[PDB]
């Protein structure tokens, strides 16, 4: 396919660069470890590689050097619709070019013929007690699909080549990626919607053909062709990519590894954020504000008296990000076209006002502002998904473009199993003096 | 006394500890990072901390300070066994204390209320393909189970409190450690002993009851207990218990942590070396010593030829030891006196005195010594475990004993969610000079 | 002394004969065929050979040169009931020899470790639609089982060789005898015993522990014995034993040969007569007699009215029989001892007093005497197993002992893949002169 | 018009024909037996009659009188296709005559009528283990459906008569035919190609819809209308063919009947020529040949040092074949416009050249020449079925068409159970005179 070849252009030039840096300048420091960020889960250590995405604490993620803002005007649009192929944005992660109109259509019939799934991913989830987390379920069904890995097929067979291995990931990234949406719509209908289902429709893109069989009328297609880019990557450190990458850089195959992801993922550290955000604000338009949108000044308030309390305000701080989040920005932007007088919204935006001049004084976070987990879910519950446990599988459907894109990497530049190194409290009290 | 105010007595104890090096010592410098390291999968970055074990590159694995011998020496023994219960070595490896006889039986008798599968686990493997790999089988069947997570449920309750967080995970902890035996066997049994089953017995101990389940005489019994406890912990660092420790390190409960830890154990560079070394000593038997038991000096060049020609000798080398496995050690010894005759067992011993100084002569191999999985194989195979691809779920049984002990330690501690720092491929150019 | 030791030296002793009979006297002939065999199904033609069982015309079965009689004189009986040790006529079908009740005791032993169902076999019975007629839930049963196929295994892994062949088959032929009763029950119990189960006793013997799943108390634990010593065998050329030898004689192993063999026992001309006849006795009781015992004068009256009104007594005639079976008489000896006073055994005795001198005298049928079939239903109901379909799980189980003793010695004195020529109605009419 | 119609027109004026043979010319002796034959699985002898097909060893096979040239070229062809309905084929079987296009377009209605799988088909096929062999699942699967038996049905109500029999059974013949290659794909989909399905396309001819639900292009669509009618029928001797006639003449259904054959189908013996061929091609090509198409003179040595190793040449002999298979030939001529230049072919095309020759030189084998199975699959290989064991299934899907066009017309005629004779050891050394 022209998508294959572009990107093993792109991993022959890419290599000699990995190469250097190991041949010649493998010994220069690049960061310290102190007994804080041992015991904090190596917080702030510079000590994972990727390029599919960068996550600056001030500008915020780019993706392949991209900002969000050049990602969502340069990438093909839908025929239709107001936003891009998921498809082209899966090349752009991949190769790092931004796709033609025809390349990205390239992809999205590509997408079409690998789109199916398999019966016994269906029986696994029946089988599953129907009153099961829906990320169980999501991790589940990809586990149950290593079955089919060519990866783990090709390693069998005893085919492994350090320069080609990651041809057979590329076809288990494309196999996986065309597949998750339908897998999340599945268990979407299964567990919510009466477990009557929509047959994929095979003239849909990617994100119209999630909205098609989630049973969400237009706009959803573009809400979640939006939700799917913004959420993409976030670099390699956040507990999914990480745990994917280190799962896979022991040659376990992409199921294997994605599984083991969203088993991160369904973390309420990692992928909760979005429907706590979403709940706290509904339970406080409930009790505080009357039932009603309120002014400033009510709110101003609230969120003093919340902070003083010893309360904090959800969807507020980050353990990377400093500045606003610019996938908060673009949520921000859908709204404001589409649902401009969603009450939900109206006390979202204020919170925008109101929050960050509120705690940059009190000083007490390091991120006075607001991460996307902020906005997700009034657009999410204004279309009416309004099953706040699902919303991390939106998460995780997302998040595989730029993950399974990262694992084809890994295995394009051939990177080690990552296998740090242990030391006790003991060893700790000792470099302490103690 | 009681297992779980036990634990409470070292959490209250240990707690102190790690507070004051966060207070009064968090800037002290411990290592440092290069860049073949951040390429090289954060190869000798000490960046974590477990107290559940500790691995020595000269000394190899202690558990809660003892080596194996002293294990295997203090740990109380399985009445009319060779070997300790199992559940003693949990018990220490969640408190740092050798258990007394009373210790050790309350928790096999704890574990005895907490052995059966849900049925919907069985329900589950049995839609699942049965082509399906077994350890794919087996991180599904423990995925399948966080339906039962008491974390899991006191957390979507809204009761979550630092202090306390680690009483549920102990419970699911326990929870899962004592049906991790019947869910391996459950799968052997389906795939490979045409699915007929041998129910639990609950006049046996942990590592009895599977050898039971698993339809194996003794002392396949013995061969259990000694795997499972030599296989129970190799500190946080090595792919499985990484992988446990980052995904619960977002506050994922034991089952998400745990399933997610055989995906990466599951890895032909994490779980497969017992299975190869195994296939390829046969292969060598067979193709290249003419069926038979080689001498010392037809091996010495069988060797040198495998290693000129371009090939590795499997189950020798790794990534931290620098010296002979203990683990590997404590398999010989079992195997010198139970099975001293069997051919492969002797490819084995012959290989452990021919293979170090030819490997340690081409200075190439960092570690010119054996780990575990050059000996695990010849003891399954000699009690008939010939379904190679199990050797991995048998891992995981045992690896369960120290990921899930250091989880419940995670929790007690309140060890942060586990998020290092990205960088670039420009980022590196950039700091190596070449703008 | 152990079994598999003992069928390796007769093994060692027949090969010889069987050489030597083709080296040396190939040729001989042995018999013709007709244009009224070819087209009548081979009837009388002499081109099967087994030793497992010979039928006599005159006298009957015989199985390894015993009749009936001696054959449940001389085979150990199970402490304390009146029947052999099924495990114990298995043992002489494989041997040729009379075991001892030590030797007996060995194969009951091997039989109790043999005995469990796979899981999968009753999952594929549930699936199976519930009113599925109980000899094709037998027949799929055994079926699916050929995945634990050790001959075939043996097979596939290239390890085939004329010599050794025999071996495999014997396990399997082990291990398939071992589960049909427990199969038979489950099939039972599923279909008419409101689907709940009784456990296999693991101190029964065949016979006991069928009774004991089944739910029936003694003694049809004997009745069991009995009916499954004498279905045993009776020779190679019946259709279901035929089938067996056919299939296997491709080198299909013993489960796919003896699914395909229940496939032709569960036809209205071989696996059916049992329960004919007891419906066709009921149906006379009920109609034609008031629901009440006849005088030997007004059956005899009844049975010449059916004659010569176009319709036949069922259970009398054979293919191949011309006198009394010995297998009806041991039946006969059996119903006497334990349910004389059975109306409906009444008129099963009195039809064998005053049928065959009618059936004589006509002149119109071969073989004027009783079979097995005319006998065996009125035990069966007489006990409360009144589902007729089920009666023909019954013949299937029982005969499996001589046909997969049968296979065993197939594979050990190699013979050859079953493949005669076909001709045309053109070719018979020019053979004939048109 | 009316298939049924016109084959009661057949039966008609066939029955007096079969009549008139029984009672005029039943003695007249057609074959004799041998011990030989006897121990040597009915070798030769001529006890079988069927009208469907005969094997004459010098001609190969004619199907009701004709040729394969013949049938290729008479029967009307699937319009925008090069190949012949595999209904029209069908109709000829039935009838002997070569079908209209009304005629055939009638059949191939039928069949679209008939073609749906049941659902606890799947059911069943899914509690199976998913690592049983194919085979086992295609007669499990067969089994399954004699729930729907219209013959059994039929017998069950007390409608049987000898007249009228052939009705339900051709009834349940059309049933079984549609549905066979759904069966077929359904269990190659769920085996081998992630268990992802391609529904039916209602106007799609048998050959056409079969190679749709298999997800393989044009021309495979012809390349199994082919393969089909080649493997129709191979008169009535045959292991699978035999196996089915046998269980039939008990008045066991076809359900019952053919899967018993695909049991013996599913033997080394018979059912796996084409597997094994073609892996001992490519093996050679790899092993023997360093990896290419070698000269004629590199490959007859090859010949000549496997053959006088005491090895044998896979698909060059035959029980009763003594010439070039006129099946193999039209597989050749297929490959010969369709794939010159497949190496797997060129070599195929080779031994065609080499392996005879050599082969009567050392005047061993009694057929020195192809048999279809030295053909099919190169051809099945370079369309990409590369999964061995399926092989046999396809040719379980042909066979269906002879074998139950034959049931019915063994029901038409009435042909009695098949019932040969036994004899012991004992008995052949007595006549042997030892």
Known sequence: SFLKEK??????????????????????????????????????????????????????????????????????????????????????????DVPTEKEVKEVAEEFKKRRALPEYVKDTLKAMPRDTHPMTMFAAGILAMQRESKFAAYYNAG??????????????????????????????????????????????????????????????????????????????????????????????????????????????????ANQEVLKWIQETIDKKLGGKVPTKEELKKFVEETLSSGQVIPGYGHAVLRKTDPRYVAQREFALKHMPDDPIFQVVSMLYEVVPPIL?????????????????????????????????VLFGIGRALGVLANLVWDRALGYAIERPKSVTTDMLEKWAGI
């Open 7 to 96: 990107l093993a252009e792109k991993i022959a030039q890419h290599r000699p660069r990995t190469t250097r840096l190991l041949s010649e300048f493998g010994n220069v420091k690049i960061d310290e470890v102190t007994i804080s960020q041992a015991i904090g889960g190596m917080r702030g250590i510079k000590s994972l590689v990727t390029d599919i995405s960068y996550l600056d604490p001030e500008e915020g993620i780019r993706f392949r050097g991209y900002t969000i803002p050049e990602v969502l005007e340069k990438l093909p649009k839908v025929p239709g619709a107001e936003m891009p192929y998921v498809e082209g944005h899966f090349y752009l992660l991949l190769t790092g």
């Open 159 to 272: 085919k492994f080549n350090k320069n080609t291995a990651w041809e057979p990931m590329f076809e288990d990234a494309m196999d996986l990626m065309a597949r998750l949406p339908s897998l999340g719509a599945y268990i979407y209908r299964m567990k919510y919607k009466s477990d009557t289902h929509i047959p994929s429709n095979p003239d849909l893109d990617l994100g119209g053909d999630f909205a098609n069989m989630m049973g969400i009328d237009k706009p959803y297609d573009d809400v979640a062709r939006l939700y799917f880019i913004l959420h993409s990557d976030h670099e390699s450190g956040n507990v999914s990519a990480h745990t994917a990458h280190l799962v896979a850089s022991a040659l376990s195959d992409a199921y294997y590894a994605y599984s083991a992801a969203m088993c991160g993922l369904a973390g309420p550290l990692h992928g909760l």
């Open 360 to 392: 940059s004084s009190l000083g007490k976070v390091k991120d006075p502002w607001p991460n996307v987990d902020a906005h997700s879910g009034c657009i999410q519950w204004h279309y009416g998904v309004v099953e706040y446990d699902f919303y991390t």
